[PDB]
Amino acid sequence: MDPETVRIALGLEERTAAWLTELDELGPPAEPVRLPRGEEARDLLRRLEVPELDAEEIVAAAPDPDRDPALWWLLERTHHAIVRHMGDHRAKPRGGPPLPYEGGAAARYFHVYVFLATVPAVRRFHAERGIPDEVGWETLTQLGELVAIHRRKYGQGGMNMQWWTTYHLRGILYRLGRLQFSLATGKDGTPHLGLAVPEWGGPLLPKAYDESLHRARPFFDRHFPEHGARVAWGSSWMLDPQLEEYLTEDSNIIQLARFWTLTDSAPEPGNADGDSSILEFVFRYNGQPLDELPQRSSLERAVIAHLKAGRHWHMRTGFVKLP
């Protein structure tokens, strides 16, 4: 098969051609790609907290080298494009494009098969780094969350956050309790830990947040001693001080943001960029008119009211020193 044939078969837009060329030149992986099937697959999916409805569909639609040659070609190389950067946080998070849904369930769950095919390689990396099994598994369970998110957002099964799962799959991000931390560097190359907050796991209770922060240095200083971060860095709608207008004192976001030192400039009031971020995380927004959006929580009302007033939300960036 050739990249141009793949592109046309899968219905991929012309801009993907460069990627497909990169993948063609990269070639298949040394260790041949293996998808778990049947009950082996169900057990893996279950361990990764994929909801039963989706898991059953993923197993049913698993593609085949003979019937799905264009998809299979892309699966091998996309897997390869990820493992070649195992442990490497300096490489960009390129998970490859989403596949048009005209290709059906195998196309919708394409990046789930990528994830499944890549579990053995990342678990090997975990073991070499001496990462505890429970931490390695807990990290990889975000697959289930991201699958569940696709279904809530769009209404059918899928997983279109493959750029994000390149972090888990390269062994550069670890869930350490309520929070996740990634091996990262600033523009000047100084090491730090990138912080992220998975959806699943309940409210961001101060005690839970604190425990995660305490886990960060001991974990990375043990398993990634060459890294040596002292500080965690976050960019988020959650760090926007404008939230203080609308959320009360018992807001976990408000209490915790107080510990952060913001390092970016006060944004231009007319900069509408952070809007799509807050809309994604609060509503899993998908173009529907603001009036139709739910208004059950104080934050849900806040996001809309602020927007209705002609105002904008901003992603803000800051740091906390690691305990």
Ligand X SMILES: *[C@@H]1O[C@H](CO)[C@@H](O)[C@H](O)[C@H]1NC(C)=O
Ligand Y SMILES: CC(C)(COP(=O)(O)OP(=O)(O)OC[C@H]1O[C@@H](n2cnc3c(N)ncnc32)[C@H](O)[C@@H]1OP(=O)(O)O)[C@@H](O)C(=O)NCCC(=O)NCCS
Ligand Z SMILES: *[C@@H]1O[C@H](CO)[C@@H](O)[C@H](O)[C@H]1NC(=O)CCCCCCCCC
* Nearest position to ligand X, beta carbon: 194
CB of 156 or CB of 286, closer to other proteins: 286
Spatial separation of the C-alpha atoms in residues 321 and 293, rounded to whole Å: 37
Six token digits for residue 17: 């051609």
Check whether 223 is labelled as a binding-site residue: no
276 lies in the binding site for other proteins (CB under 8 A): yes
The position carrying tokens 């004192």 is 249
What is the spatial distance between Cα 204 and Cα 44, in angstroms, rounded to a whole number?
Answer: 28
Position 186 contacts ligand X (CB under 6 A): yes
Identify which of residues 248 and 265 has a Cβ nearer to ligand Y in the complex. 248
Judge contact between 307 and 298, C-beta under 8 A: no
Query: Is the CB of residue 194 less than 8 Å from the CB of residue 203?
Result: no
| Chain centroid offset of residue 14 CA | 25
Angle at 291 between CA 160 and CA 266, to 5 degrees: 70
Please tell me whether 252 is known to bind a ligand. Answer: yes
- Single out the segment in contact with other proteins by CB under 8 A; choices: 41-49, 134-142, 160-168, 261-269: 160-168
Nearer to ligand Y, 16 or 251 (CB): 251
Q: Is 242 in the site for other proteins (CB under 8 A)?
A: no
The binding track of 205-244 with respect to ligand Z, each residue x by CB under 6 A or -, is -----------------------------xxx-xx-----
The token pair that represents 34 in the structure block: 């293996």
Minimal distance in Å, beta carbon 46 to ligand Y?
23
Q: Exactly one of 142, 162, 182, 212 binds ligand X (CB under 6 A); which one?
A: 182
**Residue 319 lies near ligand X (rule: CB under 6 A):** no
122: annotated binding-site residue? no
Nearer to ligand Z, 73 or 233 (CB): 233
User: Is 44 marked as binding a ligand?
Assistant: no
What is the β-pairing status of strands 261-262 and 231-236?
Answer: unpaired
Among 6-14, 84-92, 121-129, 195-203, the segment contacting ligand Z (CB under 6 A): 195-203
Spatial separation of the C-alpha atoms in residues 28 and 167, rounded to whole Å: 21
**Stretch binding ligand X (CB under 6 A), from 14-22, 178-186, 220-228, 305-313:** 178-186
Residue 93 near other proteins by CB under 8 A: yes
Query: What is the x/- site pattern for other proteins, positions 162-201, by CB under 8 A?
Result: -xx-------------------x---------x-------
HSE (CB half, 13 Å, CA atoms) of 250? 1
Binding-site ranges for ligand Y (CB under 6 A)? 197, 199, 203-204, 236-238, 247, 251-253, 281-282, 297-300
Binding-site ranges for ligand Z (CB under 6 A)? 161, 164, 195-197, 234-236, 238-239, 253, 256-257
Where is the binding site for CoA, in residues?
197, 204, 237, 251-253, 281, 298, 300
